[PDB]
UniProtKB/Swiss-Prot annotation, chains A, B:
Down-regulated by polyamine end products putrescine and spermidine. Pathway: Amine and polyamine biosynthesis; agmatine biosynthesis; agmatine from L-arginine: step 1/1. Induction: By growth in an acidic enriched medium containing arginine (biodegradative form), by growth in minimal media at neutral pH (biosynthetic). Putrescine and spermidine repress the speA gene and feedback inhibit ADC. Its cofactor is pyridoxal 5'-phosphate; Mg(2+). GO terms for biological process: arginine catabolic process; protein homotetramerization; putrescine biosynthetic process; putrescine biosynthetic process from arginine; spermidine biosynthetic process. This is Biosynthetic arginine decarboxylase. Transmembrane segments: none annotated. Keywords: Decarboxylase, Lyase, Magnesium, Metal-binding, Periplasm, Polyamine biosynthesis, Putrescine biosynthesis, Pyridoxal phosphate, Spermidine biosynthesis. Its main location: periplasm. It comes from Escherichia coli (strain K12). Belongs to the Orn/Lys/Arg decarboxylase class-II family. SpeA subfamily. PANTHER family: ARGININE DECARBOXYLASE, BIOSYNTHETIC ARGININE DECARBOXYLASE. It catalyses: L-arginine + H(+) = agmatine + CO2.
Length: 628, 628
């Protein structure tokens, strides 16, 4: 029932699933369902083989399959409607610039383009591109340097589209086009009034980054008429934003932007490209709803909505079907990487039968003991709801009273334990079928859950979980077959209390606590963080000087073999000290001296520069210590 | 009135202020009020001298003065009460590890310590420390390697305190203490029940990072009794969190934690250190209230509350006054650095007298024009509230109607402009004294504000403004003397619409728009972001591959001279491409080849590797282009 309460089947998209052994297995390519891998086994294997603690396992095969899937979805819709236009995805580097992603996509069989949101990204795109004539599209604020490079990429051979997202831009691109003597290939991004909040305006106090207002789109078409270059403007672009929860928001977005296609044609411009610009959401929770981190529409539904919109739009006015482009970055990168780490220590409560308090102790403590004895004796069993309220209030009195200076620490420590024992007892008697026992059964699972510490940095590995309440499915890599025997809250090894997971997946909705299988506190399992593929890897900050986690690319062939090559090095203490300008080399020698004036033997004096230098050039994270 | 609506006088703490010239000047050391600097002039100076665009100006003199101020505040209270204990601040590297901060503090006259929240930070602390016996305190999750290093620092000479924040830790420190044969100097961090939410428990599902439960504190004292080392435990620690808005939360925090001091003494332990652990807030808004980004208590008030608590606590039970330690990181670093950048472009609306629509145009447009003509003619002037509602609804009809395909883009562009003209007109007639004209005067300032684009990355320079709605005072470096002539919303050059400032300082409260002085849109002023000192610099992420901004240390002597030495290099496109594994060198040559097959002259073919290599090893940000 635990694989059902985690919704693995739903957000897993057939890539992840619990094998016939309780362990979570992964099938990087669901086209060959027999090519699976015991993720838990693979971890243990690499673990005992010398693998670094917090690791990032990536299955580039998923990137490719995912890409092939959306293309298939748009194909399943192009034919079903009768659309005569082509369709290809244009991955926006923004969501992940990592070589692995850019490459896995390029080196696939499906046709795709690359979008750059800045001059720096354009550079990286041109890099990955190579001598292969690839399609590139440039967005973001543009200046001379950027417009130039863009134009230089066009003259280079590459079919690069320069999206006009600000009137003042068209002036520059044109001038620089003559200076470099190159025929500009550019597109336009129009503001939409569909959202509904003054997003249509181009100068309003509304926080709408780019886009051309209705009047400015006409001025662009007019300016291109003067320089006789309407043939240049050939791409239409609009972005509704990332993670579009509600499908209607999208329909209302293409419906409108689609009229810009026809209205622009009536003015003469051609435009063979209709760029719906990403927006396609990814179900993170696993309930497939209209919530925050979840979409209420499937892959096909999205495709249909898109094609049909531009479709009927053309038919009506008798126009040719343009090439449909999309920039669903998050959509493809989403679940191709899993963060995996270990439990470095746990805080399980210790149930101990309480002993009568000092005969001459405060009444508050006598009261708590009076209630305890009353539980253990044939009286009333439903009166437990009351006994609870009793212990809670007495504990509160001695607590507030402790600060007042009218209760000893020994007394407070005593009361606290009796109360924790009171819970452990009431939690047993509790009846799950009784309506008055359910609001408490949930209250106790909280005040009785384990507090485990995972070997990672939330700010480094899942920053989106900080800036936004980004929900990421977190679960143990094994024992997913049995029923939850206890709850637990998990927090990272950051000294900041803000480093922990707030909400967890729990079937119907999200709970403040995470359900865990019966595990040995002396030897806990590994933890897996999924859907942590987009906007994550290269966007974390070194909180307590914790650097990049190590990453590995895992492959699974129909053959049955499994390749696992290194993908990322992983920062070391030394790397971090370089950032804050310290230089490890000069720091080593400074230690070499202080240790000579140790006045201690040469035996120990040297095994210290070993310990020091070891940790100096060693991983940034912690080592598993037996303090669970 | 603009220097009053920005509250500069309040959050400026005499460091920042508008000089007798409209420009914002800075006095890094208010002990010498005649040592000021025209910040706007300094920027322009360095600007025309070749300084990089987005720059970070830091006045290390402020760090020192700030430190001297809090020490003075605690001194003003130690005597006033009659406290016989010493007091010194212990700066937690966590809030800023940058050499400049660590150094400026160390190289000051005031006594201070350093706190490390991880093994990596401990390394950096030991580094900055040097051969100068300094006080160090270790926090955060600890493992062998970390505990060792800590102990090795004690044997080294440094007085390093190892804070016990988890029962399982005391086992290790003890064992490693014998292995390294060193007498351990450690402190303990106890959980408090003051907060009120089960934070007192050590294993609850509550997200409380570290701390020892009442029972565990007794077990620690007991374990140290067996190994006969109660003399080792000599530091008491508690952390209420960062930015404590309400002063009462603090009083209630020391009051309780103070009893742990006395209760622990009764058991025999000594404890000469009372660490209240940071928490001291900084007023960011400038209203000095109990809001989110603002405290309701001054420097002295905090000091008093602290000393008095531990004070009376001792007197009562007849105990000696312990050394009072605090870790107010944010408190000292807060305002010693200002982010400064330029406006790369603005979006001001263009008022143009509308022309009658096509005689055979839809009624909706006829309706908008009908209302326009009615405004320009001796009829009713208070009926403007109505005319507004009229234009709004007609514009909405043609808008929704445009998507329906029953309105041409020419018509939509027309209506939009007539409406924008309608506003510009109604905004003039509007009466500020009329009660029914104020709810609109605010509605128009929004839909008529300038949209300017600042040359920076919110995610790189002020990440805290993303993960939390961190308010930072943003204002122009000049023209602060005059009255706001227009409002404006400012957004960064990130292609993501989430890159902008949501709220701005506006006297009483925060507004969604920022008030700007009458400026030339062709030649705008510089912008300054203040209070951006803690948790900022080294904690931003390269969103669109935008690297670290450049930083400079500015000095101002009583002499009148101003020194401005370089502090940080500032990433270049090349640096960024290294991160995503690309290597610029091998990328240069790949271009060298594609340009040889350009089939174009050698004149242009070479001025391209110039342009390319220039931007490749050039700053990461954009260049000021005349598109404002």
């Amino acid at each position: 029932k635990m694989l059902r309460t985690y919704n693995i089947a739903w957000w897993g998209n057939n890539y992840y699933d619990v094998n016939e052994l309780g362990h979570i297995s992964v099938c990087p390519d669901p086209d060959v369902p027999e090519a699976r891998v015991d993720l838990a086994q693979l971890v243990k294997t690499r673990e005992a083989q010398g693998q670094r603690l917090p690791a990032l396992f990536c299955f580039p095969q998923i990137l490719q399959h995912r890409l092939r899937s959306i293309n298939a979805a748009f194909k399943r819709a192009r034919e079903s409607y009768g659309y005569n236009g082509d369709y290809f995805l244009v991955y926006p580097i923004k969501v992940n610039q990592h070589r692995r992603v850019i490459e896995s996509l390029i080196h696939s069989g499906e046709p795709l383009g690359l979008e750059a949101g800045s001059k720096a990204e354009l550079m990286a795109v041109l890099a990955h591109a190579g001598m292969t004539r690839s399609v590139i599209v440039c967005n973001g604020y543009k200046d001379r340097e950027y417009i130039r490079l863009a134009l230089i990429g066009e003259k280079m051979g590459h079919k690069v589209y320069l999206v006009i997202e600000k009137m003042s831009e068209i002036a520059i691109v044109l001038d620089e086009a003559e200076r470099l003597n190159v025929v500009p290939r550019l597109g336009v991004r129009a503001r939409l009034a569909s959202q509904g909040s003054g997003k249509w305006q181009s100068s309003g106090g509304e926080k709408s980054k780019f886009g051309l207002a209705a009047t400015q789109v006409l001025q662009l078409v007019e300016t291109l008429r003067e320089a006789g270059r309407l043939d240049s403007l050939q791409l239409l672009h609009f972005h509704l934003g990332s993670q579009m929860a509600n499908i209607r928001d999208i329909a209302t977005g293409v419906r409108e932007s689609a009229r810009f296609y026809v209205e622009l044609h009536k003015l003469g411009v051609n435009i063979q490209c209709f760029d719906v610009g990403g927006g396609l959401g990814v179900d993170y929770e696993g309930t497939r709803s209209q919530s925050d981190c979840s979409v209420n529409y499937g892959l096909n539904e999205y495709a249909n909505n898109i094609i049909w919109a531009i479709g009927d739009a053309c038919e009506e006015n008798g126009l040719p079907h343009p090439t449909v482009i999309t920039e669903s970055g998050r959509a493809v990168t989403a679940h191709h990487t899993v963060l995996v780490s270990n439990i470095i220590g746990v805080e399980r409560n210790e149930y101990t039968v309480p002993t009568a308090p000092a005969e001459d102790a405060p009444r508050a403590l006598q009261s708590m003991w009076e209630t305890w004895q009353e539980m253990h004796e044939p009286g009333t069993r439903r009166s437990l709801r009351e006994w609870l309220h009793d212990s809670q209030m007495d504990l509160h009195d001695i607590h507030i009273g402790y600060s007042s200076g009218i209760f000893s620490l020994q007394e407070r420590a005593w009361a606290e334990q009796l109360y924790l024992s009171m819970c452990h007892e009431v939690q047993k008697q509790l009846d799950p079928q009784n309506r008055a026992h359910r609001p408490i059964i949930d209250e106790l699972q909280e005040r009785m859950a384990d507090k485990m510490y995972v070997n990672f940095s939330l700010f480094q590995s899942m920053p989106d979980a900080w800036g936004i309440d980004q929900l990421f499915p977190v679960l143990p890599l094994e024992g997913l077959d049995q029923v939850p025997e206890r709850r637990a809250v998990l927090l990272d090894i950051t000294c900041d209390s803000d480093g922990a997971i707030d909400h967890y997946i729990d079937g119907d909705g999200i709970a403040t606590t995470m359900p865990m299988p019966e595990y040995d506190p002396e030897n806990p399992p590994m933890l897996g963080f999924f859907m942590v593929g987009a906007y994550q890897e290269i966007l974390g900050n070194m909180h307590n000087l914790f650097g990049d986690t190590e990453a590995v690319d895992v492959f699974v062939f129909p053959d049955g073999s499994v390749e696992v090559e290194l993908s990322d090095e992983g920062d070391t203490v030394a790397d971090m000290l370089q950032y804050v300008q310290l230089d490890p080399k000069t720091l080593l020698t400074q230690f070499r001296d202080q240790v000579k004036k140790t006045d201690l033997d040469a035996e120990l004096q040297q095994q210290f520069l070993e310990e020091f230098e070891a940790g100096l050039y060693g991983y940034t994270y912690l080592e598993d210590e037996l303090e669970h």
